[PDB]
């Protein structure tokens, strides 16, 4: 019931993604996965769970933006 | 040798650190045998050791970019440098001349070395010129040099080893301007069109004067695919055991 | 070729010796209490006993290198042999020596010092040994069966595909490490949860103490700096075999693109070899010294710095390839910001050793020599960070002389420190101390006269990866003195093996076990600890033991024979793709077929 | 209580670096194809691929929340996990026909350096979503002689979140390559 609100809202992000082509377009991609993954991390085993992927995306910025930096 | 002053000056900086830990161990330890505020106050000296180098090094990284040794912004000589396997190739675009495994440059003249490679990555070290630049097969890297004093400068490669790579030592010389102008006007064989393709095979070679520039062939700095049209057009691809000797089909210029 | 004819007969002899002497009947001890065993104590034993095996393989290779490089015009090794021997020497270390030796000292000492039974997933940790072992047999079978790689431990792409030319050369380096990368990745995932959710009551996170903290940081970089190696080789494995053009010179692909992927994994993994080396030395220098590791807000706080700052520095092995200048100063300034979180860690062992007492035993000598020798190498890598001057001493032995001072003093001594300091854990008694000092002195003095002349060899003008130097300004003796010191370290490995032929001032849960060679269940009751150092607070202060009638049930994570068959499938698929089979593999697809069948067996077994 | 929900969770954080390396490779090999075919792919197929996968999680974000956590639809496991299993073959079948149709100029990794990354950045991508089907159907063999209850049969959740991690880079691929 509560998940249907995020699922329906996520579909609008992909539709709005096509309108961008057919920063400003690099944040809607992560925001789509924030709403996608925020319904299943915390808690109990949390903090470590949602924290493990936090510095993981850091390396993704370091690897991608670092390779393009040359 | 512009960055050589960094080497000698930094040597004493770590010579002190090497003896500081001699004082931090040998002074005590022996005396002490059976028979929170210092760490935070220590955070004032460690950057002081690296920030004294995190500025002159950066003031040199940007210094080696623009016009280097002894010239402001005049006398621009260009020398296209290409690296095949084992063997070194240098072509002068100023006048139709190209030398192999040998290079002469006038002293106190800017030289815009266009660095590139043919088949394998390399880099013209030349321990007398200082900084080396990788020979990237696919694009030309600019690197300016000069000559301190008249002499015989040794030269070698970064030596990304591959059977014939330790003997990549090519001798270069730096003479006066008057003697350099008479060197061009004496030589300038020719570009035999086919002998260029006869170079990409890795063996051993002698001087090979060549009084014609080769840059009329796909630039070589671009389109680094000139390794299939090279080794394969003459019918040759090596292996590790047996049946080598350039898999048959001769024509070349070797040693002895 | 003449030399490689004797070893293939000796390799067949060792296999034939196993059948007669050992295989009278082994499906009762080898297949039961070993091979597929689950106890972490036995797994870590098989880890370091393999690294000692690789020490002799990398030893004869490393010795004959400098024996070939004794003086100019020497005709010991030709071109295509000095190229294969020095490449095998570097790859056998770090990957197949320092990695199984450090994790071996981690898969044994770490689970005891936390009070837990085994690890988080003692089943996946079983294959994590054979996953490396089949990758070790893969890389070792390149001796006579195929061909050892000859492109260096880095093995750049433009001299690796067709310009290289040997088919079964780089393939072993590709499939050998690709399998071992899977096992090592799981080794960093097992211990990241073992130290986070299996600690005993009272074992606080900030104090547990510091060596297990370095292991925590060691297994954090493994998780984020090994999937890179998993695809970096997979991309390269597609170029060689399946005909991909990621970095091939022909179809236009970037040749330097494979360099950044290898070094994005390279320098972060470079600390994975020095992090447990720092941890093992952190205890031994603070255990026999009978003091407290003074400094945690700036020592464990300094261990998190190099954990995240290890991925903003990897672009220092380049510099020479003419980058965007500013990006050559970014990673040049940043590299200086990494020798400060590491630099504070040396000022933490000397002030944990002062005011307190000390007694120089064999494990202390490994910690005694670790302090200067690692710094003498560290006071050289600081110069390598200077990109303005890195162009002068890039490669040319001065690079080799820097790191050999950094890693042999750092990890190899830690591999020897943890070898002796935690040898009573492995079996009864320990090493004879007095003749063990003979091994230390000769191995220590030969280490300096081997790589300190290399500092002069490289600065004078001797590049690396060269089989003959030549009479250049009388620089022959410096190359010979380096060889004499190289061969002086060789003398001692006999003493090291002679000491094993014989077959404490604890401050943590090391000697807190019920007896020597601790049992399977390890600790009948879990210690309350509730302090920074458990053993010292559980000795003079009160007593605290394992009282009877307070026992309980067992753990019961018995053995499963699938990890051995699972790693054989990887070894069979990898070997099939390497040894010939250029385009596709007939048996390489079967290994994936056998693996995916066993991955269905993974979630089809109830226990 | 099972720690495999966390142990096989930091592995999902490791695959972020796995796909970031392939994203770093592809983004540097973007301006190549100096000699070959320029990328001109079907637009409507990309949305049909993503909208099927965005509805795949739409039937999976509420596929364990209102399934096992809210109430107890033990009979719906052969309904919600099966319907979401058929959507996994939609991405496999469409990407296979997308690769087969790419044989017409630009086949495999041999035509150009750019197509090497595209077929691999979407290769193990396609392999991860392929083995997930064999993993989601591997747990479906439990409603027979087992039929465990929630908070005990952790096989469903640890494979559901790994299956959810796909849509993370699946959308990042949508903005990455397209
Ligand atoms: C863990 C790191 C590590 C360790 C322990 C060693 C161990 C040794 N290494 Fe090496 N080395 C590297 C890391 C390491 N090396 C790396 C990374 C490369 C480059 C990789 C590449 O690019 O290819 C390299 C390559 C390399 C070079 C540079 C190659 C070149 O530039 O041409 C040198 C220089 O002399 C060298 C020497 C030695 C010596 C003398 C030892 C000594 O420690 C030897 C130790 C030996 C023993 C412990 C056992 C002794 C053996 C015997 C007693 C057997 C005697 C019996 C008979 C001969 C029958 N090795
Ligand atoms: C255990 C592995 C290990 C560790 C810990 C290090 C540690 C360091 N390394 Fe190195 N390195 C290698 C493994 C390692 N290295 C290998 C394998 C190569 C060759 C790879 C190849 O090409 O094959 C290499 C080569 C290498 C390069 C690349 C050279 C090239 O381009 O070819 C660089 C460049 O920055 C470097 C620098 C450093 C620095 C600054 C540190 C610092 O972390 C060191 C920190 C220590 C100190 C800084 C000294 C102690 C500090 C104090 C006593 C405080 C006071 C001192 C100051 C304030 C300065 N080393
Ligand atoms: C199942 C057995 C699994 C294992 C680990 C088998 C290895 C057996 C064994 C004794 C290995 C020792 C280490 C190795 C790899 C030795 C190989 C090896 C041998 C055996 C030599 O005799 C020799 C002689 C001269 C130069 C080099 C060598 C050499 O590298
Ligand atoms: Cu590094």
From Swiss-Prot, chain A:
Q: List the disulfide bonds.
A: none
Q: State its location(s).
A: Cell membrane
- Membrane-spanning intervals of the chain: 23-39, 53-70
Coiled-coil spans in chain: none
Described by its record, this protein's role is as follows: Catalyzes quinol oxidation with the concomitant reduction of oxygen to water. Major component for energy conversion during vegetative growth.
As for family, the record states: Belongs to the cytochrome c oxidase bacterial subunit 4 family.
Its recorded name reads Quinol oxidase subunit 4
Which species does the entry assign this protein to? Bacillus subtilis (strain 168)
């Amino acid at each position: 019931x509560x998940x249907x609100x995020x699922x329906x809202x996520x579909x609008x992000x992909x539709x709005x993604x096509x309108x961008x082509x057919x920063f400003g377009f690099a944040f809607i991609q992560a925001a789509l996965q924030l709403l996608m993954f925020m319904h299943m991390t915390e808690s109990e085993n949390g903090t470590i769970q949602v924290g493990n992927t936090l510095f993981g995306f850091f390396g993704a910025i370091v690897i991608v933006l670092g390779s393009i930096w040359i | 040798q512009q960055s050589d002053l960094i080497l000698l000056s930094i040597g004493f900086m770590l010579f002190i650190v090497g003896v500081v830990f001699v004082l931090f161990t040998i002074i005590l330890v022996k005396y002490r045998d059976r028979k929170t505020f210092l760490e935070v106050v220590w955070t004032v000296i460690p950057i002081l050791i690296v920030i004294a180098l995190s500025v002159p090094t950066v003031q040199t990284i940007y210094s080696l970019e623009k016009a280097p040794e002894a010239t402001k912004d005049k006398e621009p000589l260009v020398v296209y440098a290409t690296s095949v396997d084992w063997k070194w190739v240098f072509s002068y675009p100023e006048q139709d001349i190209e030398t192999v495994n040998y290079l002469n440059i006038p002293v106190d003249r800017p030289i815009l070395f266009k660095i590139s490679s043919a088949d394998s990555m390399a880099s013209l070290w030349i321990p007398q010129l200082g900084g080396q630049k990788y020979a990237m097969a696919g694009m030309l890297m600019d690197q300016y040099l000069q000559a301190d004093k008249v002499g015989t400068y040794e030269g070698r490669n970064a030596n990304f080893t591959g059977e014939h790579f330790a003997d990549q030592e090519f001798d270069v010389n730096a003479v006066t301007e008057k003697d350099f102008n008479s060197w061009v006007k004496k030589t300038q064989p020719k570009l035999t069109k086919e002998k260029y393709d006869e170079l990409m095979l890795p063996e051993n070679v002698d001087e090979l004067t060549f009084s014609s520039t080769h840059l009329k062939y796909v630039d070589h700095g671009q389109d680094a695919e000139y390794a299939m049209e090279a080794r394969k057009r003459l019918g040759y691809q090596a292996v590790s055991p047996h049946s080598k000797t350039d898999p048959f089909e001769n024509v070349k210029k070797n040693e002895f | 070729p003449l030399i490689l004819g004797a070893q293939v007969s000796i390799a067949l002899s060792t296999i034939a010796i196993i059948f007669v002497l050992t295989y009278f009947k082994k499906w009762k001890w080898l297949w039961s209490e070993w091979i597929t065993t689950v106890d972490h104590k036995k797994l870590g034993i098989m880890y370091i006993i393999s690294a000692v095996i690789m020490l002799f393989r990398g030893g004869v290779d490393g010795l004959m290198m400098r024996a070939q490089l004794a003086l100019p015009n020497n005709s010991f090794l030709d071109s295509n042999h000095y190229n294969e021997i020095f490449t095998t020497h570097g790859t056998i270390m770090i990957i197949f020596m320092a990695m199984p030796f450090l994790i071996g000292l981690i898969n044994v000492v770490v689970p005891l010092q936390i009070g837990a039974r085994d690890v988080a997933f003692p089943y996946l940790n079983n294959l994590s040994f054979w996953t490396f072992f089949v990758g070790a047999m893969l890389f070792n079978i390149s001796f006579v069966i195929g061909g050892s790689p000859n492109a260096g431990w880095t093995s750049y792409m433009p001299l690796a595909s067709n310009d290289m030319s040997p088919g079964p050369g780089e393939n072993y380096y590709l499939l050998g490490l690709q399998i071992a990368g899977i096992g090592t990745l799981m080794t960093g995932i097992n211990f990241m949860v073992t130290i986070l959710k299996m600690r005993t009551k009272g074992m606080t996170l900030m104090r547990m103490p510091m060596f297990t903290w370095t292991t925590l940081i060691t297994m954090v970089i493994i998780v984020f700096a090994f999937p890179v190696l998993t695809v970096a080789l997979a991309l390269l494995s597609f170029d060689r075999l399946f005909g991909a053009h990621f970095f091939t010179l022909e179809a236009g692909g970037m040749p330097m693109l494979w360099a950044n992927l290898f070094w994005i994994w390279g320098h972060p993994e470079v600390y994975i070899v020095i992090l447990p080396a720092f941890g093992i030395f952190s205890e031994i220098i603070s255990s026999f010294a009978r003091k407290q590791l003074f400094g945690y807000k700036a020592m464990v706080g300094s261990i998190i710095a190099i954990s995240v700052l290890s991925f903003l520095v990897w672009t220092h092995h380049f510099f020479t390839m003419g980058n965007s200048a500013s990006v050559n100063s970014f990673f040049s300034i940043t590299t200086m910001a990494i020798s400060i979180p590491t630099g504070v860690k040396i000022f933490n062992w000397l002030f944990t050793m002062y005011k307190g007492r000390i007694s120089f035993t064999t494990p202390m000598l490994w910690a005694l020599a670790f302090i200067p020798n690692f710094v003498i190498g560290g006071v050289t890598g600081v110069m390598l960070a200077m990109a303005a001057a890195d162009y002068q001493y890039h490669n040319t032995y001065f690079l080799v002389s820097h790191f050999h001072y950094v890693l042999i003093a750092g990890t190899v001594f830690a591999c020897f420190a943890g070898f002796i300091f935690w040898y009573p854990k492995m079996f009864g008694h320990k090493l004879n101390e007095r003749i063990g000092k003979w091994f230390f002195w000769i191995f220590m003095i030969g280490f300096n006269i081997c790589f300190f002349p290399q500092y002069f060899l490289g600065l004078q003008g001797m590049p690396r990866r060269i089989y003959t130097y030549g009479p250049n300004d009388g620089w022959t003796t410096l190359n010979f003195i380096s060889t004499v010191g190289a061969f002086m370290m060789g003398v001692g490995f006999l003493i090291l093996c002679y000491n094993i032929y014989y077959s404490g001032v604890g401050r943590t849960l090391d000697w807190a076990t019920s007896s020597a060679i601790p049992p399977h269940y390890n600790f009948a009751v879990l210690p309350e600890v509730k302090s920074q150092d458990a053993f010292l607070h559980m000795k003079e202060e009160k007593t605290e033991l394992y009282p009877e009638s307070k026992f309980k049930k067992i753990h019961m994570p018995s053995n499963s024979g699938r990890p051995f068959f699972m790693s054989v499938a990887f070894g069979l698929a990898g070997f099939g793709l390497v040894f010939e089979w250029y385009w596709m593999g007939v048996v390489g697809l079967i290994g994936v077929l056998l693996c995916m069948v066993l991955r269905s067996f993974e979630y089809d077994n109830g226990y | 209580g099972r720690l495999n929900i966390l142990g096989f969770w930091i592995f999902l954080g490791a695959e972020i670096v796995l796909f970031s390396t392939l994203f770093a490779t592809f983004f540097v090999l973007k301006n190549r194809t100096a000699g070959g075919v320029l990328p001109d792919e079907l637009f409507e197929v990309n949305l049909v691929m993503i909208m099927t996968f965005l509805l795949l999680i739409s039937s999976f974000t509420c596929g364990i929340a209102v399934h096992e956590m809210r109430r107890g639809s033990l009979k719906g496991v052969v309904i919600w996990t099966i319907i979401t299993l058929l959507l996994g073959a939609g991405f496999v079948g469409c990407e296979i026909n997308e690769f087969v149709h790419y044989v017409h100029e630009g086949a495999a990794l041999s035509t150009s350096a750019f197509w090497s990354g595209f077929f691999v950045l979407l290769g193990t991508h396609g392999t991860h979503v392929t083995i997930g089907i064999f993993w989601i159907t591997g747990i479906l063999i439990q409603l027979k002689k087992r039929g465990l209850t929630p908070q005990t049969s952790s096989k469903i959740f640890i494979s559901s979140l790994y299956w959810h991690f796909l849509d993370v880079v699946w959308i990042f691929i949508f903005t990455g390559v397209y």
